[PDB]
Amino acid sequence: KPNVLILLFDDMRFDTFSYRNGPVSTPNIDALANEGTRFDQAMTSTGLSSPSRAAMFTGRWGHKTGLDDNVGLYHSRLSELSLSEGSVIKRATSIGYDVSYVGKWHLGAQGPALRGANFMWGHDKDEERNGRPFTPYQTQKNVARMNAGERDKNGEKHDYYKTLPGTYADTVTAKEVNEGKLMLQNAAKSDKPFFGIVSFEQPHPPYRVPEPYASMYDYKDIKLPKNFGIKRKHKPMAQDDIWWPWHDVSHMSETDWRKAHSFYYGAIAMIDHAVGELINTAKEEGLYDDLHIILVGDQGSMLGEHNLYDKGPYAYDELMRMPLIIRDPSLEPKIINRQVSMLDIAPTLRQWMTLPLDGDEDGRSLLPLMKQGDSADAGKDDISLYAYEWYNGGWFGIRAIRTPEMKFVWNPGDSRDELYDLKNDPYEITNQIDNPKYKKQLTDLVHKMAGELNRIDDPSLTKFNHHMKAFL
Amino acid sequence: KKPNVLILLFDDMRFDTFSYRNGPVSTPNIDALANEGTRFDQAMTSTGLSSPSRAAMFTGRWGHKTGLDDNVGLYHSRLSELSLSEGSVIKRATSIGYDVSYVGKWHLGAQGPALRGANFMWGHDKDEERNGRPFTPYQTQKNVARMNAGERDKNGEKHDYYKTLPGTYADTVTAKEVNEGKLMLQNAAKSDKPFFGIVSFEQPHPPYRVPEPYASMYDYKDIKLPKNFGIKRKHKPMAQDDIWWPWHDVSHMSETDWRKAHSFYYGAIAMIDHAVGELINTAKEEGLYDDLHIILVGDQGSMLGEHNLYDKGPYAYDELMRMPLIIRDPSLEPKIINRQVSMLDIAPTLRQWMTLPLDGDEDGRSLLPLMKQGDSADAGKDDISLYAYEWYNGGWFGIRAIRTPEMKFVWNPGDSRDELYDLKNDPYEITNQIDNPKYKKQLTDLVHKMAGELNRIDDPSLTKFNHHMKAFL
Ligand SMILES: O=S(=O)(O)O[C@@H]1[C@H](O[C@H]2O[C@@H]3CO[C@@H]([C@H]3O)[C@H]2O)[C@@H](O)[C@H](O)O[C@@H]1CO
Ligand SMILES: O=S(=O)(O)O[C@@H]1[C@H](O[C@H]2O[C@@H]3CO[C@@H]([C@H]3O)[C@H]2O)[C@@H](O)[C@H](O)O[C@@H]1CO
Ligand SMILES: [Ca+2]
Ligand SMILES: [Ca+2]
């Protein structure tokens, strides 16, 4: 029974790290990447916290678990993942793992502890269940201030980026790290196999870091991507609407957008420090050599691509793609360019830990790819499936299928679907859904999507077959 | 011996506009029907939204039972049609030998009245394919962007709010609906079978679009605006702030724009009163009127700048929740009913008139006892109405309101903020008393009445209600 450590980051993009030729020096994460299996085409299940984390820890899609929206936020109907879903936490506890959780669960108050984990520290550890949804009255007020031409301290916009006082040592990140260090120190004292999960606040927006992380990256020097700042042409209406108050970016100057990038880059540098501290503690405690490690970000985050901030009901790569490293100490490092999914984490843990079956696995174990490289999947369709069923009480029922060359997005709450040529338009600027030059690729993707919805028993297959009747 | 029944169903018609209600618009034809029938002056819709209200009206069950709990065919609702497993009063009446006819929009799925056995004579959704993509309001979005830039449409108007149409009454959709209604009455008078006719009028759905002389009949300069007009919402739920449909951004509206929204609406009500006169005079000419069992109703009201709101959205304010209702039974002397009654009470009333067969639960009650006896039919009973706003076009809110003659409590389980209004001292619902200790006893009473109602209708939200209201429970 191997020791397992999961380092789980909130809204961390795939692309920012130096090992991915990104703009931020990340030596600690690069070292882990180069020692483990790099999943360079990892895709989240949904660009939203609770749905992604329920998929990650259960191995099933939201229509099976019921966890298909964020919990405890205006205006979601949901409060918690059902205690009927034990997740890998209860399954690992059931076979003699000491499971520990640091940081926020995002799946209901007390959730890790109710499933048998030592919930060492975190926002939702001691909260009462069935709380009223958090309704962002203060954020609404503050975005109205920005629209009136006001700024916060030192000309900043604190719903986007903020210089925190004090030092790294004063941060929530430093606390999460210290509880992870304690978790590793305490596991080294035990005979029993351990399963540790550290769920980091960072880099959740707004981008809030102390000096020197706050000014490490000069906003003037930021390289803005080709889809930055553009007007959305022929895109679905859900990308326009102000779902969370800070989605009104009409007030953002180019300087505001560059600081959103530079402060985000500071947060990634601070995360790289935090990863180094935890890895060095595992090494000091003699746990690192045999440690089975997953580093993952639940989803990415928008920094003004398509003039979007944060996240919302859409499928763009900057949100859908996720960073993923899985380090098996028995295996030589490889880089996997075949697409993989958040639905593949629970099966991988299941194979590592011999977890007991608790129902369906909608994904697959990544051990064959980790051992053999991309040739494990020779002959198979290279696809990923993404869902955006809800955004905080807005129903959208979105489904995206992504091949290495194309993406088709079904928006059943709209009349406008999306079709992107990823080979010729990797920045997803031009919606080709109505372009007759793409009829063959669309027809192919529609068939692949029907096959995926059938495979996972998604009940929206019926509506899909109605909407796509021109192609069947 | 089965009676002839006619339903005149109007879209977003307020309770208060008519001259028989001491309102601003001269409505002699509707007044004559009110004076001949049973006035339900405290009628409440089930939801301030078309498809939910009409599924409640025609099934007699709440949308958690029927599944019809949002609009159909609109960005970004999940729904397309009322299940064919719900026959409604249409199939039920057909099954017992009524010739059922439908004129105008169904709003419950393409071909719906026809699939249930009605002659769907004419209407927007009569010949449409089913399972169509949701109508997504790209042009209204672009229009409101022009408004926000300071633009006006032709002649200074704002056509997402009010519009002078060219030509005459005779050129209008209203005139076409009336012509098909006249043919319906003429056809009924020639048949042996009892008839059940439903005319579902487009008017007065916003924007307020009428030809001359209705467009200028009521001078915008003379419009009396109410006490809750134009106010800043204080301590009100976040769902009232959000621009759900693009025309909900009224930041660009002048006081003149709001007065023309009223004056064009009043013109539409005058045009409706003409249309009602035409159909009633055809019923009289055909020898049907003396024995005709009539319901006149608006599916819900509509906001005209009260709490700075336009049209409708997920909220429970009286101008939306209240509906006009007149029920005329030719065997009964006229009465005014001030007890609250609900859209859930229409299907049971039809059931008692027509001896319709049982097709499951009735969540409301027949209004025949009130029509015969007056308000004292309900002596010793709590005077309450229940309202739900489960969805607004793909936005989930799960709202429930209970209204007594003196108080309203609104539960907003998508929010941290509930509403409590003192209707006796604050009938304009300006002040949210939810946190005011002086109202603790009334709030406790309303929370218990709401729990009782959710239990009665087997609403599965009662679990969450018991958590949110645990300080009571
Ligand atoms: O930790 S939380 O994600 O729960 O923090 C939330 C909230 O985060 C949200 O912000 C918007 C709305 O939903 C998404 C994002 O698009 C979610 O990340 C955060 O912004 C707010 O300030 O704190 C709450 C917790 O109270
Ligand atoms: O006759 S319809 O109601 O179907 O017309 C709709 C639309 O009406 C809607 O307008 C907003 C969105 O939901 C409510 C209201 O709040 C609904 O009445 C109408 O405005 C538009 O012009 O036409 C569509 C049908 O195509
Ligand atoms: Ca997240
Ligand atoms: Ca309506």
Author numbering:
A (entry chain A): 36 to 507
B (entry chain B): 35 to 507
What does the paper say about this structure?
Therefore, to provide insight to the specificity of this enzyme we generated C84A and C84S mutants and attempted to determine structures of this protein in complex with neocarrageenan oligosaccharides and fragments thereof [Supplementary Notes (section 4) and Supplementary Fig. 10a–c].
The polysaccharides in red algae (Rhodophyta) are primarily mixed galactan agars such as agarose and carrageenan. Carrageenans are high molecular weight polymers having a linear backbone of repeating D-galactopyranose units (G) linked together by alternating α-1,3 and β-1,4 linkages. Furthermore, transcriptomics revealed upregulation of the CarPUL during growth on ι-carrageenan, while biochemical analysis of eight CarPUL-encoded enzymes revealed carrageenan-specific activity, thus associating the CarPUL with the ability of these pseudoalteromonads to liberate energy from carrageenan. Detailed analysis of the enzyme activities encoded by the CarPUL, combined with interpretation of growth phenotypes, have allowed us to propose a refined and detailed model of κ- and ι-carrageenan processing by some Pseudoalteromonas species.
